[PDB]
Design a protein around this ligand. Structure first.
Ligand SMILES: NC(=O)C1=CN([C@@H]2O[C@H](COP(=O)(O)OP(=O)(O)OC[C@H]3O[C@@H](n4cnc5c(N)ncnc54)[C@H](OP(=O)(O)O)[C@@H]3O)[C@@H](O)[C@H]2O)C=CC1
Lengths: 277, 263, 279, 279, 263
């Protein structure tokens, strides 16, 4: 559905690389329609992106001039410097998609609006699994984003994962759930593998089994019309190994730790922004 | 090049062991150890400044402003003033010295005691008027006693929490590891030696490896074995979270000390 | 100073420990890579191909390793050792020194198996660790009933080329396993966590890893070159009111010291179990 | 060596600290009991009658203590000190050295009050503890703005007769309060608990109390006469595998060390609050 | 009277400092310290027995049976064999020695390192053939380096848990107290001195007092004050229960060691 559209990344780190790789693997954009810029790009990222077909430049202004959709994939405190640098180069045609945690549409529009009125701004929160086209993305549309800009954004990010529109005031909470969530999963998978190794499994097999168990269970829940508590009941046979293991999770307050984590990440996201303003 | 001190012993021993500085090219302002090594010693902090090209400030965060008020009139355009004082900001030094002559060349250093065996961890930040070659000279000199790299000043608190306080974390761990060896039947001297050799060897393995520390943990924990059993008991006590707590607590205290220096 | 540079070394097992020792010995230059042979069941291991790239001879036949070797290291999971000793017992010759690195496996259990084939097998029990790969291992050994005096000296000379090495009574080896055998894994865990702490406080992860590892290496070296107690070095570096003593307090409040005692004890007890489960 | 045996000493307050110092001074023989006067609101205290039996002069009038004294100790609850200084400020003479043992009460707050009456009051701030009663106190002092050089020496000579004594900067006294000021109560608590442990394991309570107190006295003396770190002495006395290292493990698992850090900190912070609540 | 050793240094230093024994009347089987004090030294454990009247065994619980098998033929009717070896029961000593001559006079001692400054805590139990005057002589000799009293042998495990391990508890407490002093701003050397002086003074106050330790706690905790605030934080961590745990753990380990000696 995207024939001539070109995409740019300001930033070439973990998230920009994941999105660019997922977009190209999706085939929704020709790789040569993608440009990425950063001032000191790691030579291994240069090599991988070049082999992918992505165009590269140190000059953010070239990315702006190449792009129709412009992703801001720098650290949150870098956003206002970027907006000052490129603000005079924003055109009517641009959609500016901020991926930065915490950074409000309001703050981006106030910077850009000093240069040309009505910047079209979308704020999104995604996660690194876009790199395997299983990301979880939400976006909120800015004051001057045309209704079709949101639709275009959704169609584009839907090619690398789940994607849905939210009110901007949910994004910090999403950040604490699906933005940080992969790190919770990787922590859990490392520990589950340690557990399998303690009970006699080779590490390589433990890592594989644990990751496959998690992927399968998550897919079961997504494809099920059932409450996760009901799936827990379905697979916990009376007197069995699983309900014994669930008891030891409950005794250490397992559930409360995950709630603590979502809360901690969301709150930190709010604090950082309140320091930015 | 001449170097002066006003952690002081550790760097002078490390420098001289490195052969980067002759001992006598170094004046100071513990005394029998320095005099033995060949280090000139003087009580009058003013003599140290007149003698030196690169001037280290190794005094408590409380004794820096009084050191600067004393020797401020004596700083020349040639000097590089390198501050290792915990929590003393570049701003508070420049502010004091600028009253005497403008554009003082100031570098803030965050190093640790293992420079004394030339295995320190050092970062430095360059001040307003430090020329580019001043920071290159600093890196070259401090690289002779360990790792050295440049950082922004606003990361020195974090570095303090990690490699600044780090050796104390390790000394604590080695004392406890030795208590464990002794509980299980080892003589104390053997337990201390083995535990310290295990930490050094593991740190070197990581430093020479292109591998994540978790990957090295994976590689050495055989299935069902003694090591994975022991890792589990570490995990059940929240071992990892305590070390995060420590880096955080030391970094945060350093920010409080920077606040006092800036007031 | 015994001459051993021309002798042949075999490993039964081609895993992490065999790789580590073979790498350390060849990097020390004390043995030629073609003097080393290793046998293993599974060849599609990363360690089998690493041995191959070093120039070590690889084979699936344990007898061939035994016939090649003068010094024979046993570096397989413990419960495997009786099946190995049954398989190769008839191939042990008078020239062989058998060096068991199998954790928990006692000299007695080895000598009992091997004695059924030839009397007076020369056996040495070894406890070492993976940092021999960077020539900073921590190794202890105990000599068996028929080990000659020069066997112990040869073992000490060889293993000193890749780190600290000293003779102990056999009844210490289980505690050594809990301390320096498992010790590197405690250190890797600590370094991961310290780097997470550095990242929490604003450092890039690569720098935090480097700084934390350098801090631990340097502190460990300081202690080894000091004649001082680790508590004295802790005292010497903790300035009044400063950042370090504040961090040490939060370590103490979580019982940091007790966790490391708990770990040494747990590893040592598990090592004792593994022997008892064998016997 | 200053001569002070004939001088007169007053205490405003007749509580535990006044009793302890008066007892310690008289037991050291450095002052005559009739040279000491103490004033207090309530006379039906056990400490008032103990002072009486020692031969100390007791009175309800703080002015009379001031007129009697050359050295004047303030040993009342802190919030009382401003009302005392208002009451007796006009009676301070040039001969007086005022020695405040009120915890937290700063030299500044005292000098400000007393300066309204006569300029240059000679003030010393003291932090001591109850074991001066057995001449084993731990005392520090800081000299005020108008304290002569000999005032500090006189104070050190006097307080050294009842224990350790040294001069400090005033900004250490709050931390000293948390450590050796409160320290005896930590020790009494520990001794009660250790004796309960002895009773649990079969000892009669009287013996357990004696053995535990003697163990602590002896260990403390060993440390003071050693040039060694307490961790080194801990190492020296903990035999491998033995009873002591097993007990030290259970101490560590409850975070014993952190509780004592917590206590010093809590006492020091409370002392800082009490000054701030005053100011 | 002649005394021999085969904790050994601590008693010999304490005895000689006490003037109860001339240094040369003592033979032993750390070496420069003893030789300096005037203590005869010999490698051959047999020479020590021939020299001595009262014979101390200061070796690991593991090295006692081999010491007894060595010198057993040399024990005479005059000897009192005093064992300080941790966990070695009177029964296991008498059993070994009785093979050589019947009725060996054996005393089991539980003392601690502060005998080196003559403030030890010692209990002793008399063996099957120890005459009444043997235990009186023991009490008189050990009273010169600290407290000494007789107990039943089945209380020595408890005493071990309390005053045997006690000094290690105190060294640990003094290190932590000093960390606390340092955290709050004190120099380390001052913090160590003050904390040790506070413990010594408090222990002496209790020893000289006719008062319960809780009464002394009450007497020194002023209402609302710094001390009662600090006691509360001790209570919230279960401080008292940890010390009970410690005495129990050391006593129980001593019973396990007695079981090994008796097997
Ligand atoms: N990683 C994740 O899981 C997620 C990240 N995000 C958000 O995405 C943004 C980036 O995250 P991440 O990719 O992890 O951070 P990285 O640190 O991995 O990459 C940061 C990038 O910003 C670049 N950069 C810095 N200054 C400039 C500049 N002046 N002009 C252009 N590029 C510059 C860096 O350049 P150089 O290459 O020269 O260093 C680097 O390429 C953050 O705001 C984060 O919140 C959102 C969801 C999840």
């Amino acid at each position: 559905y995207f024939q001539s559209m070109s995409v740019g990344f300001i930033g070439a780190g973990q998230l920009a690389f994941a999105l660019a790789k997922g977009f190209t693997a999706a085939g929704v954009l020709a790789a040569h329609k993608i440009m990425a810029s950063s001032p000191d790009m790691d030579l291994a990222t240069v090599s991988a992106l070049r082999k992918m077909g992505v165009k590269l430049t140190p000059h953010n202004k070239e990315t702006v001039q190449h792009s129709d959709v412009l992703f801001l994939a720098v650290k949150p405190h870098i956003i206002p410097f970027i907006l000052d640098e490129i603000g005079a180069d924003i055109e009517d045609r641009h959609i500016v998609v901020s991926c930065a945690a915490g950074v409000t549409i309001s703050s981006i529009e106030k910077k850009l609006s000093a240069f040309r009125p009505a910047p079209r701004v979308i704020r999104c929160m995604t996660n690194t699994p876009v790199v395997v086209r299983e990301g979880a993305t939400v976006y909120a549309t800015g004051t001057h984003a045309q209704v079709e800009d949101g639709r275009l954004m959704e169609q584009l990010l839907s090619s690398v994962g789940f994607c849905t529109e939210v009110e901007e005031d949910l994004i910090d909470a999403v950040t604490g759930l699906s933005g940080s969530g992969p790190a919770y999963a990787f922590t859990a998978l490392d520990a589950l593998a340690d557990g399998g190794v303690k009970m006699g499994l080779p590490r390589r097999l433990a890592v594989r089994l644990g990751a496959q168990a998690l992927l399968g269970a998550a897919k079961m829940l997504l494809h099920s019309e059932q409450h996760p508590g009901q799936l827990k009941d379905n697979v916990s046979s009376p007197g069995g190994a699983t309900i014994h293991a669930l008891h030891v999770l409950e005794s250490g307050g397992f559930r409360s730790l995950l709630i603590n984590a979502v809360e901690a990440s969301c709150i930190r996201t709010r604090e950082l922004q309140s320091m930015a303003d």
